[PDB]
Design a protein around this ligand. Structure first.
Ligand SMILES: O=c1c(O)c(-c2cc(O)c(O)c(O)c2)oc2cc(O)cc(O)c12
Ligand SMILES: O=c1c(O)c(-c2cc(O)c(O)c(O)c2)oc2cc(O)cc(O)c12
Ligand SMILES: [Cl-]
Ligand code: NA
Lengths: 301, 301
């Protein structure tokens, strides 16, 4: 019993973190097989940050412009290339700790664990969600660029995020491990702002189910609704539309608790319309939306 | 920027988790050097839960009554002893993945990371605090007994908790790695209840300092308070007393932010009186008390 925000065990990823230095810039890299992955903005100096020409910056670089350090051991760089916004450094040594892995691009609303690192050294791990506006509400200080996000499926590490930048709101932006940004962002120092965010409705429903499983039942009621009526409420309160696919995904939790999704939607409708009346759900006074249905099943069953 | 409940990277502890079986009971153990630590109630049968005599149960056991599995490798037990409520199994192989470590007993209010495990296999990592009533608000299911809590300040793992049992309210109780319980609890299934819990005042103040460091000042006010007047008020909201030690502990954060400790106490008094009027602090609509002054300095700029 109990319900906590839980991250995946990070050991398999810890063995892949290295330090990458180009000139006076030092950040984190991911060492898998004989390649190190890091943000391409490592090749930028301060005179380049506002309008970098990454093509020209890279062709000017040679292998000897990069220092890769794995703990106390220097890895010799024997090749370099760019894939989108990620720099790929070929090294002369394959990482003996490389886990079974794949690169996976996630969708908004999906969750993942982040291994926050500084100077190639793992510092902490936390769980977060890709927001509908394609930012993440991370916790990053200067030097965390290149920290990665991941899930573990059976025994395979699915890498889904590399950290690139902090936006003026304090939220964070990054890419998949193939260098494609999440969200309408570019790797430059320029006027960039997160769009207005929305709440991840299917995750809120998942968390209400977790609340019921844990004995919190005060928000349940006799009423049911329709997708159509609920989605007009959702739009009203800046909640993502609920789709039929979302309903099917919650099917398991609906079957285990006796509260059909549209039954629970009537609870959520009511909580949006009237509120929590001074009460809490799972120790929170806000409606939590960074647990997926998968996350709830994994932790509650 | 940003602020997350952040756990320590769990790899150093993952490499120590094993499975221990005696009879039909299987739970987790901690393999360090040539010793495996686990809860002594692994030697109980269904008849031995209310009033076990562990001395009498253990003297009946041979080394070969204990099955220890490290992943796929069965470890040979060559000796056993009981230290308070922890069973220690000597094995014929020292764990090659043993990290730098030590055993520490913590005080209420202290935080640590938990690596939740089932059948000797890590499932997830989360952050938590020793409550003033000597329980922890964990997320544990059947089979998690023997999971451990730890910190990793610097490169040394400090083991401070081993999980033994769930109480009727769903909170959790356990021991230090010398087998001494936190709080008045015992390893019997007789009715035991956690005392009334209270809010960890010094941690709430640390988290308000974190909010200021991250750029939020909306909750400050023009007032101050004496220590005694603060405690008279806060105890009416079931907050723990604030001692002069706590005031001294908050000295560095007071210096970094320019807000005197007793001025921040005046702000907390007003927050308890007013609530947040629709606002949040570091993303929360309630006052968070599971970040210590040390944690805030660790994670914040
Ligand atoms: O927010 C940013 C940021 O943090 C870094 C960064 C991270 C590190 O870890 C470093 O060591 C470093 O030198 C820079 O680069 C950036 C580059 C941009 O074009 C835009 C940004 O917004 C950032
Ligand atoms: O709450 C308890 C509990 O969970 C376990 C336990 C944990 C496991 O992981 C097992 O596999 C197992 O068989 C028992 O023992 C207990 C023993 C007590 O005297 C009292 C308890 O309250 C528990
Ligand atoms: Cl302590
Ligand atoms: Na209903």
């Amino acid at each position: 019993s109990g319900f906590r925000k839980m991250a995946f065990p990070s050991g398999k990823v810890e063995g892949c973190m290295v330090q990458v230095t180009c000139g006076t810039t030092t950040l984190n890299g991911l060492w898998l097989d004989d390649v190190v992955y890091c943000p391409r903005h490592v090749i930028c100096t301060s005179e380049d940050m506002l309008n970098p020409n990454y093509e020209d910056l890279l062709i000017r670089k040679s292998n000897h412009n990069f220092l890769v350090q794995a703990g106390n051991v220097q890895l010799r760089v024997i090749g370099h290339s760019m894939q989108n916004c990620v720099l790929k450094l070929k090294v002369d040594t394959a990482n003996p700790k490389t886990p079974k892995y794949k690169f996976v691009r996630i969708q908004p609303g999906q969750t993942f664990s982040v291994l926050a690192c500084y100077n190639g050294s793992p510092s902490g791990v936390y769980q977060c969600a890709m927001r509908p506006n394609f930012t993440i509400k991370g916790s990053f200080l200067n030097g965390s660029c290149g920290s990665v996000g991941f899930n573990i499926d059976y025994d395979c590490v699915s890498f889904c995020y590399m950290h690139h930048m902090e936006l003026p709101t304090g939220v964070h932006a990054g890419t998949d491990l193939e260098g494609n940004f999440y969200g309408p962002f570019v790797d430059r120092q320029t006027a960039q702002a997160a769009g207005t965010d929305t709440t991840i409705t299917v995750n809120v429903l998942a968390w209400l189910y977790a609340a019921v499983i844990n004995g919190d039942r005060w928000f349940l009621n006799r009423f049911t609704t329709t997708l159509n009526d609920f989605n007009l409420v959702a739009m009203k309160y800046n909640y993502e539309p609920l789709t039929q696919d979302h309903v099917d995904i919650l099917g398991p939790l609906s079957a285990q608790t006796g509260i059909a999704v549209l039954d629970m939607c009537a609870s959520l409708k009511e909580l949006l319309q009237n509120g929590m009346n001074g009460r809490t759900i799972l120790g929170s006074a806000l409606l939590e939306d960074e647990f997926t249905p998968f996350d709830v099943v994994r932790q509650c069953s």
